[PDB]
């Protein structure tokens, strides 16, 4: 499967549509398709690549930084997240934690 992933940068008011394989992380696909996103660790252990789900679901089992409540609130580490449906996600949310 190939899912449609919509990236929304709220602060800059931009929107990018990318197509992501069910076996590829969102971050990797975005880059491949021409859209650079913030990252640091690239391993699900930090907050740099955080985004927030608007709609859809993802599989981010490889992550380790977010707690259960943050996950429930819809936070996702884009560097280790696989889409499991078409997804709409707000990027550049690292700040929201704090």
Nearer to ligand FES, 8 or 44 (CB): 44
Q: Residues 54 to 93: which contact ligand FES by CB under 6 A?
A: 65, 77, 79
Instruction: Give the Cα separation of 4 and 40 in Å (integer).
Output: 25
- Any residues with CB less than 8 A from the CB of 9 and at least 6 apart, and which? 15, 90, 91, 92
Closest CB to ligand FES among residues 4, 42: 42
Q: How far is the CB of 54 from ligand FES (least distance, A)?
A: 19
Give least dist CB 92 to ligand FES, A. Answer: 12
Q: Which residues contact 14 (CB under 8 A, 6 or more apart)?
A: 7, 8
Nearest approach in angstroms of CB 78 to ligand FES is 6
Q: How many residues are there in the chain?
A: 98
With respect to ligand FES, which residue has the nearer C-beta, 49 or 70? 49
In angstroms, the CA 80 to CA 60 distance is: 6
Tell me the window of 4-12, 34-42, 68-76, 83-91 that interacts with ligand FES (CB under 6 A): 34-42
- Looking only at the bridges linking them, the beta strands covering 87-90 and 2-9 are parallel
């Amino acid at each position: 499967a190939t899912f449609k992933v919509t990236l929304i940068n709220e602060a800059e008011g931009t929107k990018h549509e990318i197509e992501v394989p069910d076996d590829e992380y969102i971050l990797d696909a975005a880059e491949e398709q021409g859209y650079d996103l913030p990252f640091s660790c690239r391993a699900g252990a930090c907050s740099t690549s955080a985004g927030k789900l608007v709609s859809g679901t993802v599989d981010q089992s490889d992550q380790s930084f977010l707690d259960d409540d943050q996950i429930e609130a819809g936070y996702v580490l884009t560097c280790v997240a696989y889409p499991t449906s078409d997804v709409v996600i707000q990027t550049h949310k690292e700040e929201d934690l704090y």
